[PDB]
Amino acid sequence: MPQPKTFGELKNLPLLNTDKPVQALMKIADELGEIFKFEAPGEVTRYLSSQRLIKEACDESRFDKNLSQALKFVRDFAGDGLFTSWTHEKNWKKAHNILLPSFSQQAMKGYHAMMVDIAVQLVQKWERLNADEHIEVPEDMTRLTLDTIGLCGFNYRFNSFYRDQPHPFITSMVRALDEAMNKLDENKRQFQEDIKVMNDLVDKIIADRKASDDLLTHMLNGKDPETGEPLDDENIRYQIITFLIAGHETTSGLLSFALYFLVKNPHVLQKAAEEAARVLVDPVPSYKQVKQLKYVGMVLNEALRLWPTAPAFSLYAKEDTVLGGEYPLEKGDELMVLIPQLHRDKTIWGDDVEEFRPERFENPSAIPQHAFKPFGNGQRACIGQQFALHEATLVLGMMLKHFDFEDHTNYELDIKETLTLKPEGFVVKAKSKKIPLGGI
Numbered sequence: 001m002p003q004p005k006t007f008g009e010l011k012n013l014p015l016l017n018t019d020k021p022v023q024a025l026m027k028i029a030d031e032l033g034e035i036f037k038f039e040a041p042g043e044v045t046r047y048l049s050s051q052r053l054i055k056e057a058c059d060e061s062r063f064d065k066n067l068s069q070a071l072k073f074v075r076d077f078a079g080d081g082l083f084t085s086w087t088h089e090k091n092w093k094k095a096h097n098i099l100l101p102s103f104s105q106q107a108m109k110g111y112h113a114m115m116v117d118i119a120v121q122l123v124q125k126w127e128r129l130n131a132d133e134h135i136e137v138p139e140d141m142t143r144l145t146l147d148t149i150g151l152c153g154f155n156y157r158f159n160s161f162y163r164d165q166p167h168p169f170i171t172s173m174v175r176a177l178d179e180a181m182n183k184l185d186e187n188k189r190q191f192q193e194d195i196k197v198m199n200d201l202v203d204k205i206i207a208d209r210k211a212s213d214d215l216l217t218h219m220l221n222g223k224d225p226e227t228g229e230p231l232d233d234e235n236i237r238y239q240i241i242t243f244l245i246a247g248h249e250t251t252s253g254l255l256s257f258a259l260y261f262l263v264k265n266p267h268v269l270q271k272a273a274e275e276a277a278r279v280l281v282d283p284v285p286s287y288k289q290v291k292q293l294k295y296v297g298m299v300l301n302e303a304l305r306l307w308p309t310a311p312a313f314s315l316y317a318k319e320d321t322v323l324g325g326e327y328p329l330e331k332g333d334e335l336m337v338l339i340p341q342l343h344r345d346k347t348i349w350g351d352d353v354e355e356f357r358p359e360r361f362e363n364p365s366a367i368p369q370h371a372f373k374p375f376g377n378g379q380r381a382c383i384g385q386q387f388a389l390h391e392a393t394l395v396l397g398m399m400l401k402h403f404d405f406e407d408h409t410n411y412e413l414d415i416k417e418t419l420t421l422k423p424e425g426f427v428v429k430a431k432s433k434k435i436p437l438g439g440i
């Protein structure tokens with residue numbers, strides 16, 4: 001098995017000593033191929049890049065989700081919520097069983113009005129810009145997703161479009177997330193009561209609810225079919241914090257990368273815009289109209305192919321096994337799935353992997369199993385997938401309906417890395433088509 005440069009007792013660690021470790025890992029994957037070993041003090045893992053090896057890794061009888069160091073740091077505030085819990089923890093299966101149906105495609109009909117509420121606020125903000133102004137894309141997309149998850153999650157309004165200093169909860173959460181990633185002594189005091197700012201607000205809202213079909217309502221009314229137990233108030237709080245953590249920046253990034261790819265590819269933009277104009281015939285889009293935005297959905301999947309915004313997930317071997325008939329693994333050995341490399345597997349996608357061509361997704365069932373995994377794998381895959389895609393499709397569709405866009409700076413893609421991926425600095429100008437935008 002190949003391995004990049006080691007640095008004594010530092011091992012490969014110094015190689016991640018950069019702002020952009022995943023893109024660095026992609027270059028290593030370019031050099032070393034489909035699998036390479038990567039070591040740090042106390043650690044070892046194997047990065048997989050090919051559909052061939054990744055399909056085996058996705059076999060749930062053989063491998064299960066691993067809590068990476070990043071997830072263990074996030075667990076200090078996300079607790080035993082779905083995202084940061086072991087599959088074998090009682091609370092994982094319990095919250096999973098309870099929440100699954102509330103995250104189905106069917107369930108999206110119930111969140112649609114609230115999603116529309118925030119989407120309309122975004123579009124009006126842009127309708128109301130003067131000629132001398134431009135849009136900060138990922139910044140506005142993050143306002144949108146945070147507010148949407150807050151509203152659909154626990155019927156709470158962060159009112160991010162009424163501020164440029166975020167609601168104190170957002171500031172604390174963002175601070176906490178950033179601290180947890182930087183760990184990979186005043187920081188410690190700040191971390192502790194950012195945690196406290198988060199728990200305080202969420203606990204309060206839960207307590208107030210005690211004395212509407214959103215999520216929180218589902219969680220207060222849910223019983224796990226296996227045990228017959230409901231979730232306790234502490235876990236509910238962790239789940240709420242979890243939806244925000246896992247959902248806000250992944251989804252914001254997707255919207256940002258899609259708009260980036262659209263303005264860099266005017267022919268696709270025009271085709272996407274034509275669909276939006278034909279489909280979204282009402283001042284407020286309906287749930288069914290969003291489902292008819294087929295090409296918009298393809299644009300989104302092709303953005304996730306090139307830059308999956310949660311670009312790596314970790315697995316461990318349940319038992320001794322041999323990977324791909326050539327790499328023996330022991331129980332507990334770790335693997336990392338490098339999603340952006342998987343999505344550039346020429347043997348699956350053809351040689352033009354770097355090109356933005358949404359038409360690749362014209363026939364989704366033509367895509368081999370485990371070739372496309374922006375939402376992770378199996379029972380530990382993203383529970384928010386339908387929610388994320390419905391939000392992004394609704395919002396992108398509305399953007400395309402209501403504005404023409406100008407890449408006025410000729411933006412140079414600069415991909416910032418945290419827990420997630422984002423096109424940092426991406427800005428555009430939006431000229432309104434002056435089309436009625438209505439009462440929800």
Ligand code: HEM
Nearest residue numbers: 082083246247250251254310313375376380382383384388
């Ligand atoms: C485009 C947007 C999104 C992407 C690309 C994404 C990606 C992912 C990935 C890759 C995982 C697996 C992590 C791992 O295996 O360690 C995951 C898990 C999860 N995500 Fe998403 N996510 C997105 C949006 C959302 C949203 C909007 C929500 C909630 C509203 C959400 C909630 C969760 C939860 C609760 C888990 C843990 C599920 C479990 O293990 O039971 N995500 N996500």
